[PDB]
Every structure is written in structure tokens, then in C-alpha cells.
Design a protein around this nucleic acid. Sequence first.
RNA 1: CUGAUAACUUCACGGCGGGCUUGAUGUCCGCGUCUACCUGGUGAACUGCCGAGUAGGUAG
Length: 198
Amino acid sequence: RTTSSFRVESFAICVHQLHVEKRGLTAEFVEKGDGTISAPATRDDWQCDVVFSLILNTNFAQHIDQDTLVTSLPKRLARGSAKIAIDDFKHINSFSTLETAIESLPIEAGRWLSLYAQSNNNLSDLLAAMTEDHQLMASCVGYHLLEEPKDKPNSLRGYKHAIAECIIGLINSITFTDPNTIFWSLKNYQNYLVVQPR
RNA sequence: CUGAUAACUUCACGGCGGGCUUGAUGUCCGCGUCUACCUGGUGAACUGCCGAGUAGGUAG
């Protein structure tokens, strides 16, 4: 709003805790079309409780506020509810070098996120790539497009509607030192979109 | 601008009955710990009287 130079431009992620299990999801009896009110079809759902800390690399020189840092952060992360405890607002700050940021996290378990940039052009060279440490993850990394793009009326906000598919790259972990094997950033290559570590 | 926005799974529930693990059994022989060795009070809390009094009171 005020400082339109903020430009986070990169981000490092540190997953401190991850638990995944089956819960399902109850919808709310929407109309089937003629006159009858009943629940829609039944789907089965995996979901997770994620505890993590971020360190952003912005371009603005100092902090913002503490009245107006907390009311500037969204409450949503991949349909979840993502929040910070209100007796923990003191550790939000802007340091000026990386190595002084690591001892100001009062959480202390790591697994910073990079990727595995080796030839994995099928599935069999993934399952032959997993059982050595097997704390390893295969997340979503980007979108390989299909269409050009083009445009047609009922888009989100008048923008141009392409059609795409997902990318199933591998995610590894770092005990932690060079800050460019970390610090993901989004790049466009005119045929796909991938978050790359710069 | 997050495969976007929204999304109460729940009610009841007696695993019980019975059961002999035992018999026998030689661990022993031999064996040199020794040599050497300064904890110091600088001078430093005196001289008397009474009490039959290693106890007890005095004056300076």
C-alpha cells in the first residue's frame, strides 16, 4: 500500500513439522436441480497440519510496523487456515544478512527445501531414487501449459485463459550453506511455469 | 492473487472356562612393587593484689 517497492522476489521455506492423514470433507446439501435438497457426491480427502517458518528476501530496507505487520498477512494457505500465535509477534524483524537469521528462530528443526535436478523422466527412476534416506517428497513444482494462451469471456478478472497440467518434480532437504541452492523464485519460459531457486 | 472462494460423519457395544517342567554335575597349578624429601610463629597478650582453691574476682 505505502511502500510499493517491496518486491519479495524469492523465498526460502523451512518445514519444521508435517503430519498428513485422512479426514474427508462434508459439503452442505446443495440443490440437485429440481426440488430436492441432499448432499452432493462423496469424495475422499487427504489433509495435513503444517508447521513452518519463512525468511523472505525483500528489497525494502527496514521493517514496516507491528500494529500493521500482522494485519498485512493472509489467513489462507492451500485451502487451510494459516496463523501465528499472538504471544510470538516479537520475532518478526528485518535482518541484513543470512547467517544472523538462523539463530533468531526459536523452533530448531530444519529441512529447508530444494529440488533434485537429475534425470527422472519416468516413474521407475523415481522409486529407484527414493530409498536411500526416504524422508523425501514429490510435490508440485509448476505448470506445463497446453494452449497459447487466448481469451474468452468468463475468466478471472478479464485475464487470458490458458489450459495447463502439473509438474511432479522431487523435493529434498538440507541440514544447513550457499544461499542459491535455496531461495525459490518463479520463472516463465513461454511454455511452462516453475518455481526455481533463482 | 495459493488445482480459487464454501464445506459440524455419528449413535450402541460383558472373550470366557482348564492346566506338576524335571533327573545328574571336583575349576586348578605358579607369583619380591622399590629408590629420594626442612612447612615456617622475624621480635610477638605484662607486672601485681584477694581467694585454704589447675575452679573463681580484681587494679593498671
